Structures are given as structure tokens and as C-alpha cells.
Write a protein that binds this DNA or RNA. Structure first.
Lengths: 48, 113, 51
RNA sequence: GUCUUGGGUG
């Protein structure tokens, strides 16, 4: 939940996500990129 | 921010008496006096005046804390005498001594002119 | 000073150069009953200036 | 309101 990775406020209008949130976003991007290889051309040096 | 006022040393509040007398029951004919808003100036004067009376058997004072402007005085007297009466007697005697001292100082100062 | 009586011992007395250091008690005294907490842990924040 | 760096105190 967001409690484990809360955001914060820089100057009254700004927020950066916690490290875990950006890490989870990167994991999601990696997952979707994986689901973009077994659906089309993939010369075995991109799947790995 | 925690400093008390410099006039609470001498200015008596309205809820604080100047003088408060309680008896010491352990020994006969003894009383404990707390003087508020006073210091060593009155205490030592009174103590050394009272210590020289024949009928005063015990007299002492202390200032329990320097940050609080009061002192407490223990005074005992013999059977006939009351410590209170000895206290007025000492006050009157010191008043007379200061009056004589003032008269002689003024005369001396005039002669020096 | 209280009695005007002489002190039985004599006192080493004279001028000495002293310094006023930057550490004053009024810059250090801090108390907290309840106040702001941290976002993540919900525990009291760190700092005299932050309460 | 957050992270690092630096100067310090007992």
C-alpha cells in the first residue's frame, strides 16, 4: 500500500514518489516489455 | 524566558504575608518565624541582637535557597519571657541604636565643616 | 558578604581573561509533549527547531 | 517536507 511508500512535499506544490514506487514502476515497464517479445519478432538476444 | 522579576525580591504580594509565626512544639516556649521579601540584612542584625539577651536561650536563622527571597528564624526564650516580646524588644533596641548613631554622625559631619 | 566577618582562609584574587562561548542554555532548552510526527514511521520528528 | 555534505557539543 501507499503507506509503506508515502510521497512527500518539496515546496508547497511538489512531490516525488518514494524509491519503492519508482522501482515498482521500472518492474512494470520490464514486465510489459517482456510481454512485447513473445508477441512478435525476438531473435533470442532480446528475450533473455 | 525563565528569569523571574528583579522586584519580586522586595515587593510583597497581596496574598503573601510579610511575617508568619508558628510554634516549635518539640522544645518549650519556642517559635518559628518566616520573613518574606527579606534577606541577610535584617536576619543577621536581629540574630546578633537577640543572641545577647539573658532571657534568649536559642536564636538562629537560615536562607534555605538563595534564589528565593525569604528567611526563616528559630527563637526560644525562658519560661517567663515570650519569644515574640523579645522580638519587639530587639527591634526597638536596634531602632534606638540607629537613632543615636544618626544623631552622632550628623553632629560629627557638622563639626567637620 | 553576609556577615562582614573575615574569612579564616585567604583568597587568591585578581583579574583573569575570560571568554563568552557560543553555547547558551536558551538555545538548547527543549521540551515536547506532543507534536509533529514523521510521514513514514509516524514517530516524533528529529530536531529542537522542528519541535 | 526529504536526502546527502560540512562544522561542532557532552
Amino acid at each position: 500500500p501507499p503507506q509503506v511508500r508515502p510521497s512527500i512535499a518539496m515546496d508547497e506544490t511538489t512531490q516525488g514518489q518514494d524509491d519503492l514506487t519508482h522501482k515498482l514502476s521500472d518492474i512494470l515497464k520490464a514486465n510489459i516489455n517482456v510481454q512485447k517479445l513473445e508477441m512478435d519478432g525476438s531473435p533470442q538476444h532480446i528475450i533473455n | 524566558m525563565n528569569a523571574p522579576d528583579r522586584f519580586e525580591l522586595f515587593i510583597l504580594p497581596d496574598d503573601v504575608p510579610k511575617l508568619k509565626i508558628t510554634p516549635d512544639s518539640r522544645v518549650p516556649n519556642c517559635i518559628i518565624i518566616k520573613f518574606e521579601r527579606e534577606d541577610h540584612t535584617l536576619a543577621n542584625l536581629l540574630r546578633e541582637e537577640l543572641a545577647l539577651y539573658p532571657d534568649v536561650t536559642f536564636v538562629a536563622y537560615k536562607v534555605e535557597h538563595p534564589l528565593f527571597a525569604n528567611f526563616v528564624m528559630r527563637l526560644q526564650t525562658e519560661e517567663g519571657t515570650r519569644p515574640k516580646q523579645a522580638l519587639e524588644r530587639a527591634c526597638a533596641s536596634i531602632i534606638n541604636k540607629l537613632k543615636t548613631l544618626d544623631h552622632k554622625f550628623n553632629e560629627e559631619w557638622n563639626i567637620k565643616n | 558578604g553576609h556577615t562582614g566577618k573575615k574569612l579564616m582562609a585567604q583568597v587568591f584574587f585578581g583579574p583573569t581573561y575570560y571568554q563568552r562561548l557560543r553555547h547558551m542554555v536558551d538555545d538548547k532548552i527543549h521540551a515536547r509533549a506532543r507534536g509533529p510526527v514523521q510521514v513514514l514511521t509516524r514517530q516524533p520528528v528529529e530536531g529542537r527547531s522542528r519541535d
